[PDB]
UniProtKB/Swiss-Prot annotation:
<feature type="binding site">
    <location>
        <position position="52"/>
    </location>
    <ligand>
        <name>Zn(2+) 1</name>
    </ligand>
</feature>
<comment type="function">
    <text>Cysteine protease that cleaves viral polyprotein and specific host proteins. It is responsible for the autocatalytic cleavage between the P1 and P2 regions, which is the first cleavage occurring in the polyprotein. Also cleaves the host translation initiation factor EIF4G1, in order to shut down the capped cellular mRNA translation. Inhibits the host nucleus-cytoplasm protein and RNA trafficking by cleaving host members of the nuclear pores. Counteracts stress granule formation probably by antagonizing its assembly or promoting its dissassembly.</text>
</comment>
<comment type="subunit">
    <text>Homodimer.</text>
</comment>
<feature type="binding site">
    <location>
        <position position="110"/>
    </location>
    <ligand>
        <name>Zn(2+) 1</name>
    </ligand>
</feature>
<feature type="active site" description="For protease 2A activity">
    <location>
        <position position="15"/>
    </location>
</feature>
<protein>
    <recommendedName>
        <fullName>Protease 2A</fullName>
    </recommendedName>
</protein>
<feature type="active site" description="For protease 2A activity">
    <location>
        <position position="33"/>
    </location>
</feature>
<feature type="active site" description="For protease 2A activity">
    <location>
        <position position="104"/>
    </location>
</feature>
<feature type="binding site">
    <location>
        <position position="50"/>
    </location>
    <ligand>
        <name>Zn(2+) 1</name>
    </ligand>
</feature>
<feature type="binding site">
    <location>
        <position position="112"/>
    </location>
    <ligand>
        <name>Zn(2+) 1</name>
    </ligand>
</feature>
């Protein structure tokens, strides 16, 4: 459960996208587990445009925010699941942190703003879908 509301867009995990998200689809990528749809209202989330590797993420499963050190967006292998077959997910950042399946969508942010959303996790790690390269969300 979680979305980024920037301007006239709504950024969500592709595996949790609703029927309304597909009826107003702007762009989607299975490799990135991202789906951007349109909204009528004007979102106020600031997207970070940077090369940060430290920030704070929100953990629904513990109702706590956590400071984490994270990796550069890369091509990481994600085991098979009930949404996607076993594949390499691109633009993914890993950190040491608690994660549960109901934690997808939780925001990651640095001093500059929103970095990405929780997408993968397991074995003591947590993985984030990066949104800093998507410069069109601001424009
Ligand atoms: C926060 S997700 C999590 C956390 C702890 C343990 N297992 C998970 C589950 C997970 O990693 N998923 C399931 C949903 C689809 C994901 C994907 N991008 O393909 C992979
Ligand atoms: Zn930053």
């Amino acid at each position: 459960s979680g979305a980024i509301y920037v301007g006239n867009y709504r950024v969500v995990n592709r595996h949790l996208a609703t029927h309304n998200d597909w009826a107003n689809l702007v762009w989607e990528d299975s490799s990135r587990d991202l789906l951007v749809s349109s909204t009528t209202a004007q979102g106020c989330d600031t997207i970070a445009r940077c090369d940060c590797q430290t920030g704070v993420y929100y953990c629904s499963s513990r109702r706590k925010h956590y400071p984490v050190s994270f990796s550069k967006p890369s091509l990481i292998f994600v085991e098979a699941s009930e949404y996607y077959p076993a594949r390499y997910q691109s633009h993914l950042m890993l950190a040491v942190g608690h994660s549960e399946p109901g934690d997808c969508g939780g925001i990651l942010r640095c001093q500059h703003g929103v970095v990405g959303i929780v997408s993968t996790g397991g074995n003591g790690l947590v993985g984030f879908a990066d949104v800093r390269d998507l410069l069109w969300l601001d424009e």
